Amino acid sequence: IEDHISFLEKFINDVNTLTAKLLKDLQTEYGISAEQSHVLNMLSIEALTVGQITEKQGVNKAAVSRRVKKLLNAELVKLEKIIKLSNKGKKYIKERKAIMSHIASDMTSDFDSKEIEKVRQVLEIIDYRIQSYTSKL
Amino acid sequence: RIEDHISFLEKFINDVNTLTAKLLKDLQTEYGISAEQSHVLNMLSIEALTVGQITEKQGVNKAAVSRRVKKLLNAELVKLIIKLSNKGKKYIKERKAIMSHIASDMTSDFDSKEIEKVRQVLEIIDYRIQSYTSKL
Numbered sequence: 224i225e226d227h228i229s230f231l232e233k234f235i236n237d238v239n240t241l242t243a244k245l246l247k248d249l250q251t252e253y254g255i256s257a258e259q260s261h262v263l264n265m266l267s268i269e270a271l272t273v274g275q276i277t278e279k280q281g282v283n284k285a286a287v288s289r290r291v292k293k294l295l296n297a298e299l300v301k302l303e304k305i306i307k308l309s310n311k312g313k314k315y316i317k318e319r320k321a322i323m324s325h326i327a328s329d330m331t332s333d334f335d336s337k338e339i340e341k342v343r344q345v346l347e348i349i350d351y352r353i354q355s356y357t358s359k360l
Numbered sequence: 361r362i363e364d365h366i367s368f369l370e371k372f373i374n375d376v377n378t379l380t381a382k383l384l385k386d387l388q389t390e391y392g393i394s395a396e397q398s399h400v401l402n403m404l405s406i407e408a409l410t411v412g413q414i415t416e417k418q419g420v421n422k423a424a425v426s427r428r429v430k431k432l433l434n435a436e437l438v439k440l441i442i443k444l445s446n447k448g449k450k451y452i453k454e455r456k457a458i459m460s461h462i463a464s465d466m467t468s469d470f471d472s473k474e475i476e477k478v479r480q481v482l483e484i485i486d487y488r489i490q491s492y493t494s495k496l
């Protein structure tokens with residue numbers, strides 16, 4: 224009802240808590256911060272400019288800028304103008320997907336591919352609508 | 361196969377985060393709080409906890425959290441322990457009103473069976489997540 228909204232909130236919070244911990248090392252190894260890690264993953268889908276990363280994130284442009292030219296300085300991200308990723312930035316993503324899919328696999332090894340398929344169809348349809356509403360304001 | 365489901369879940373979450381971010385700017389601006397401050401009010405909307413555990417859930421490191429707490433204490437949004445105020449209840453309510461109306465108007469053409477099956481699959485995955493997290 225609005226039980227689903229609370230569940231989702233709690234589900235997303237839980238996924239972030241797990242992700243943080245599993246990614247603590249890789250991040251330390253890269254000089255990277257959590258939020259920077261995110262930008263690097265947020266940027267895993269499309270090249271973005273500071274404002275877009277700020278809008279799609281809620282935080283004050285100031286903070287988003289500090290962590291953005293730290294990634295350029297680290298050659299983890301790059302200009303063109305927009306912001307794409309660099310090999311060291313990619314290698315990070317690979318190492319990230321790897322830690323993620325190894326545990327994701329675990330807790331889902333006894334799942335039924337068909338049931339998961341339909342579930343996703345629904346989520347993809349809600350994702351589509353979420354993005355759509357987000358375009359206006 | 362799963363590498364894909366991971367990307368989507370992640371995109372799905374990125375989009376949910378984006379969306380709540382836009383739908384709540386005006387409101388946080390209104391109650392004069394930052395987004396991080398908002399999130400802090402939402403965990404305490406559920407239950408109240410001290411600083412020690414408040415950062416353990418988050419992930420944002422050293423004292424950064426206690427700084428949000430005292431920031432929120434100053435607006436009379438959070439009472440000391442540290443829980444939630446009467447002023448805080450209003451925000452969440454207003455927050456929930458927005459989140460729900462939109463979430464409903466976005467799920468309203470689906471078949472109850474359909475949604476439930478989604479919940480049941482996300483619940484089980486959340487059950488394994490925590491259980492894995494717990495095993496520190």
Ligand SMILES: NC[C@H]1O[C@H](O[C@H]2[C@H](O)[C@@H](O[C@H]3O[C@H](CO)[C@@H](O)[C@H](N)[C@H]3O)[C@H](N)C[C@@H]2N)[C@H](O)[C@@H](O)[C@@H]1O
Nearest residue numbers: 254255256283284285286287288289290291292293296
């Ligand atoms: N605080 C808010 C302000 O931050 C930055 O100002 C400066 C940062 O503070 C510096 O980073 C410092 O603080 C970081 C943690 O935040 C540390 O990791 C780092 N070692 C420190 O050198 C960075 N090198 C230059 C940057 N111009 C942003 O530009 C500005 O938009 C924002 O308003």
Ligand SMILES: NC[C@H]1O[C@H](O[C@H]2[C@H](O)[C@@H](O[C@H]3O[C@H](CO)[C@@H](O)[C@H](N)[C@H]3O)[C@H](N)C[C@@H]2N)[C@H](O)[C@@H](O)[C@@H]1O
Nearest residue numbers: 231232233235236280281376377380395396398399402
């Ligand atoms: N409880 C489950 C919910 O968790 C967040 O709810 C809160 C957000 O997290 C806040 O986000 C900002 O404040 C966080 C504080 O820690 C920062 O970490 C984060 N990087 C910031 O952008 C936002 N401003 C308010 C929102 N009520 C998610 O957004 C939401 O999708 C999910 O349903």
